[PDB]
Amino acid sequence: ESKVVVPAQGKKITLQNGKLNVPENPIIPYIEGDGIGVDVTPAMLKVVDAAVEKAYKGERKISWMEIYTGEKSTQVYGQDVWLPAETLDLIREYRVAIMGPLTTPVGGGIRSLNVALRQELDLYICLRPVRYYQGTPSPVKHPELTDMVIFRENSEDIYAGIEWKADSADAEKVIKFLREEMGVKKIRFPEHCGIGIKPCSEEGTKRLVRAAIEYAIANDRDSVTLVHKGNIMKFTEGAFKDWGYQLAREEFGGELIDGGPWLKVKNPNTGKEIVIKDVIADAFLQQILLRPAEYDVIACMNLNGDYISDALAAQVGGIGIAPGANIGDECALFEATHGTAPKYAGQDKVNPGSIILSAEMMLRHMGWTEAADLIVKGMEGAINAKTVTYDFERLMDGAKLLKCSEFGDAIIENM
Amino acid sequence: ESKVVVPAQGKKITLQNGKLNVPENPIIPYIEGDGIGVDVTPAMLKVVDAAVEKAYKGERKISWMEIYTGEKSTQVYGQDVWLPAETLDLIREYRVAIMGPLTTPVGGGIRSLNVALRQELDLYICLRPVRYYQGTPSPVKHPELTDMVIFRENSEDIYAGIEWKADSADAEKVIKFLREEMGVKKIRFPEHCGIGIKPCSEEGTKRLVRAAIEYAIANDRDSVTLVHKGNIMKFTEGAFKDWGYQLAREEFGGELIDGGPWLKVKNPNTGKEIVIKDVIADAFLQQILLRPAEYDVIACMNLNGDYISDALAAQVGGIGIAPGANIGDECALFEATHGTAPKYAGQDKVNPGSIILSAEMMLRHMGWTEAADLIVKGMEGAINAKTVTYDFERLMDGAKLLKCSEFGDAIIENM
Ligand SMILES: NC(=S)c1ccc[n+]([C@@H]2O[C@H](COP(=O)([O-])OP(=O)(O)OC[C@H]3O[C@@H](n4cnc5c(N)ncnc54)[C@H](OP(=O)(O)O)[C@@H]3O)[C@@H](O)[C@H]2O)c1
Ligand SMILES: NC(=S)c1ccc[n+]([C@@H]2O[C@H](COP(=O)([O-])OP(=O)(O)OC[C@H]3O[C@@H](n4cnc5c(N)ncnc54)[C@H](OP(=O)(O)O)[C@@H]3O)[C@@H](O)[C@H]2O)c1
Ligand SMILES: [Mg+2]
Numbered sequence: 001e002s003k004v005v006v007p008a009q010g011k012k013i014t015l016q017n018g019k020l021n022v023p024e025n026p027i028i029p030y031i032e033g034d035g036i037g038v039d040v041t042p043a044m045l046k047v048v049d050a051a052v053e054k055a056y057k058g059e060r061k062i063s064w065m066e067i068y069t070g071e072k073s074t075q076v077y078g079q080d081v082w083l084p085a086e087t088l089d090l091i092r093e094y095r096v097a098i099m100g101p102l103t104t105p106v107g108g109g110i111r112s113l114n115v116a117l118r119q120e121l122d123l124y125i126c127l128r129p130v131r132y133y134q135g136t137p138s139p140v141k142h143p144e145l146t147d148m149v150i151f152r153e154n155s156e157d158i159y160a161g162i163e164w165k166a167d168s169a170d171a172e173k174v175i176k177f178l179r180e181e182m183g184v185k186k187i188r189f190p191e192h193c194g195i196g197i198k199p200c201s202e203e204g205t206k207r208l209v210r211a212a213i214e215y216a217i218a219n220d221r222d223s224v225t226l227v228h229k230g231n232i233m234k235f236t237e238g239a240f241k242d243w244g245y246q247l248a249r250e251e252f253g254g255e256l257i258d259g260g261p262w263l264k265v266k267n268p269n270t271g272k273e274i275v276i277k278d279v280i281a282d283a284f285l286q287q288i289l290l291r292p293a294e295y296d297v298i299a300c301m302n303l304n305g306d307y308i309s310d311a312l313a314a315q316v317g318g319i320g321i322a323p324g325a326n327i328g329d330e331c332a333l334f335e336a337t338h339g340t341a342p343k344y345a346g347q348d349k350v351n352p353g354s355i356i357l358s359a360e361m362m363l364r365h366m367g368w369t370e371a372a373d374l375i376v377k378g379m380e381g382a383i384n385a386k387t388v389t390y391d392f393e394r395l396m397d398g399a400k401l402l403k404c405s406e407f408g409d410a411i412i413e414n415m
Numbered sequence: 416e417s418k419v420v421v422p423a424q425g426k427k428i429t430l431q432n433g434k435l436n437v438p439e440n441p442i443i444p445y446i447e448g449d450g451i452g453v454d455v456t457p458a459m460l461k462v463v464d465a466a467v468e469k470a471y472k473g474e475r476k477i478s479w480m481e482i483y484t485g486e487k488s489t490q491v492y493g494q495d496v497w498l499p500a501e502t503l504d505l506i507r508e509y510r511v512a513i514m515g516p517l518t519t520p521v522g523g524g525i526r527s528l529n530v531a532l533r534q535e536l537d538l539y540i541c542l543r544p545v546r547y548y549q550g551t552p553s554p555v556k557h558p559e560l561t562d563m564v565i566f567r568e569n570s571e572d573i574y575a576g577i578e579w580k581a582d583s584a585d586a587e588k589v590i591k592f593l594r595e596e597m598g599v600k601k602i603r604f605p606e607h608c609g610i611g612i613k614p615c616s617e618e619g620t621k622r623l624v625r626a627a628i629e630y631a632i633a634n635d636r637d638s639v640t641l642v643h644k645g646n647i648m649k650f651t652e653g654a655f656k657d658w659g660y661q662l663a664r665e666e667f668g669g670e671l672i673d674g675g676p677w678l679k680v681k682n683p684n685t686g687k688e689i690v691i692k693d694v695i696a697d698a699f700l701q702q703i704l705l706r707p708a709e710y711d712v713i714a715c716m717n718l719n720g721d722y723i724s725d726a727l728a729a730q731v732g733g734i735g736i737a738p739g740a741n742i743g744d745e746c747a748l749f750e751a752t753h754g755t756a757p758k759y760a761g762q763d764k765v766n767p768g769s770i771i772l773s774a775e776m777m778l779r780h781m782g783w784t785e786a787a788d789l790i791v792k793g794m795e796g797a798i799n800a801k802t803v804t805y806d807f808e809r810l811m812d813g814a815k816l817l818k819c820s821e822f823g824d825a826i827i828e829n830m
């Protein structure tokens with residue numbers, strides 16, 4: 001008994017030849033989000049509607065359709081309905097959707113609803129661009145040097161969720177198999193030992209890296225860096241790196257730079273030579289602080305991508321305004337990347353910048369680049385004006401403190 | 416046919432009741448290290464001898480004994496001798512040793528000689544303190560707020576080196592077992608798929624965390640933070656966190672703070688209440704930049720520790736002066752934490768600060784705290800004086816450029 005209401009006015013986005021066909025009146029599902037979702041989502045809807053209205057002079061308008069996942073879903077659909085099958089169907093059917101932060105319960109056997117959405121819908125790209133907005137308080141000296149785009153593999157790695165508890169019958173069965181059938185002698189303590197499995201495939205790797213290189217081409221970026229810990233994990237992380245370079249050679253004409261191992265890929269549109277290179281993951285966490293200007297598009301596995309995107313967001317002062325998308329071949333889900341911060345829920349206090357910039361990505365994904373540009377311009381102006389929410393204000397001198405809703409308005413005021 | 420020469424003058428350190436018994440004339444094995452090892456090691460020997468001479472007025476003296484691992488070992492012992500069994504025996508027998516950076520070959524089937532040393536000798540603690548030295552050029556605004564000590568688990572995690580290549584008979588055998596016998600359906604692409612195993616045990620976890628809490632007590636530190644990605648890896652990383660808290664409760668009288676989950680442990684010597692807490696790994700990489708003063712002793716698994724120690728070293732401008740130890744119940748191996756940087760080898764150019772501060776840790780481990788304090792004082796003075804090696808100098812104005820050897824001398828000059 002669906003409680004979703006399909007908008008009377010509005011038409012479904014469709015997909016033909018890997019190209020989105022977006023009508024003037026697209027229906028866009030949104031999940032409000034739990035906790036501060038109640039604050040940031042209304043601000044997002046208003047900012048997006050204003051950008052769309054202004055950009056296309058009223059010719060285009062989104063028909064927002066609320067759908068459910070998280071604690072709110074339990075209130076709507078019932079007790080154990082954290083992720084209704086209907087939500088998976090609707091996101092796939094309508095092609096483009098956006099969500100606030102989600103509450104995943106503890107003590108009931110769910111790792112992460114965000115991860116569940118990504119995997120169930122096969123949204124294999126976690127796309128997280130990290131740039132600096134002039135005027136943002138930052139813990140680093142030169143945050144303006146950071147302008148990167150993270151392509152985080154979203155469907156494999158240790159995120160597969162394949163593991164067994166220490167002392168469980170299953171764990172002991174796996175360990176026995178490893179020691180006795182596979183001849184494994186490297187388990188230091190085989191008793192009271194939890195076990196996890198890390199898969200990495202050629203297909204999984206290459207579809208991710210393919211998207212990263214296509215993005216570098218489409219957006220005239222300077223380089224793609226494969227980040228990995230392949231010196232220790234030779235057959236997963238090392239394989240990821242090798243397959244990435246191979247893909248560049250086989251599909252994009254990548255040629256050896258000097259004596260290797262870096263490659264150059266010719267941008268078929270601009271003639272720019274895009275560098276394909278690689279950095280070991282621990283060293284990369286140093287490089288993003290010490291030589292940020294040398295990095296651009298980043299391609300990495302699921303866990304590394306999780307870490308890198310957080311580290312980069314922190315350094316640009318963007319912990320609360322970091323945008324994110326999850327993109328697959330059939331649909332895409334844009335998301336606030338911060339948590340539910342329930343202590344502030346309903347106080348109209350927190351920064352709606354993250355979900356707003358994820359909506360910017362959404363508009364851009366829809367081909368509505370003018371509306372997207374207006375959001376960027378608005379965000380830039382508001383931050384430059386020092387008219388900001390508490391999280392920025394408390395780190396600044398001479399700023400004007402704005403509520404969440406009010407910061408949404410300041411963004412519009414600056415379009 | 417050993418090519419190691421046991422010093423005529425000198426006596427073996429011994430171990431009784433988990434307490435080192437260090438004579439006035441201890442024999443200390445050292446590995447010179449490959450590449451820039453030839454530059455930084457001589458500087459380390461000179462600085463350490465000066466600190467020891469000055470601290471104890473000639474009553475004490477180290478008898479250095481060269482031992483081998485890495486490319487130099489192949490030159491001494493022969494073609495495929497990258498890690499002679501003799502070196503493992505000698506480090507265990509003499510209890511305390513130090514090494515420069517090592518060349519691990521590529522294309523011959525060795526992940527890392529550093530990891531091999533750690534695992535073979537069961538040096539389950541990777542101890543990496545990260546502090547700021549006034550005057551060091553840093554990419555962050557307030558590096559002085561960083562004063563942490565990393566306890567990185569050194570014997571388990573994905574470092575166990577258990578994995579199989581995509582398309583290999585073994586990989587397919589493991590995957591078949593997983594899908595057919597374990598009923599695993601979560602492998603997105605089971606073909607052309609590499610597989611790695613991640614173990615985490617109660618014993619492995621608790622011996623690491625035990626050392627971290629004992630350290631916090633011995634050194635009157637403020638808190639121990641368990642860092643993990645337990646929300647996704649419930650039975651490895653999540654288990655690590657749970658066992659860590661449990662250890663604090665069961666062995667150290669840890670009591671609930673407020674409504675949890677943090678605990679307080681009473682320092683039995685100073686009565687200080689040590690906070691035991693936890694942070695998810697991605698968030699922690701933000702916290703170390705945004706709220707560094709809130710963190711002190713860190714306890715984490717092998718891979719997370721690898722990443723965290725690099726990230727912290729970068730932020731204090733200490734990429735080339737980060738000290739490190741590997742400690743087990745029977746012996747300890749102190750190490751330069753940077754690479755071999757062969758392009759500079761023999762030019763007397765690079766920073767010997769890392770191996771020098773690892774030697775400071777070594778002296779402190781030996782109970783020679785006065786000599787260790789002299790090295791710290793010397794390092795602080797030299798850096799404050801802006802008499803520094805090229806890696807610092809190029810980031811500063813009005814500094815005096817010193818050779819590697821000369822910086823070693825400046826450290827002595829400042830004792
Ligand atoms: N079971 C669940 S739901 C769970 C558990 C762990 C992690 N996560 C995930 O991991 C990430 C972090 O989540 P979390 O739960 O650890 O964070 P939360 O507890 O929800 O938020 C922690 C702090 O981040 C700051 N913050 C978050 N959003 C903000 C905004 N829009 N404006 C200003 N400040 C903001 C606030 O800092 P101050 O209080 O200092 O102002 C807040 O107290 C999220 O992606 C989340 O989905 C989820
Ligand atoms: N197969 C081997 S041996 C291998 C491979 C990968 C990683 N690792 C390990 O991973 C870590 C990093 O090693 P790596 O090989 O990637 O680094 P390296 O190539 O050996 O060094 C890279 C750069 O770091 C800087 N640097 C290193 N030591 C320095 C010092 N003492 N003073 C000043 N600058 C210094 C230099 O930067 P500038 O040129 O800019 O001045 C150097 O070019 C090490 O722990 C290493 O053991 C080992
Ligand atoms: Mg994350």
Ligand SMILES: [Mg+2]
Pocket residue numbers: 282721722725
């Ligand atoms: Mg490392």
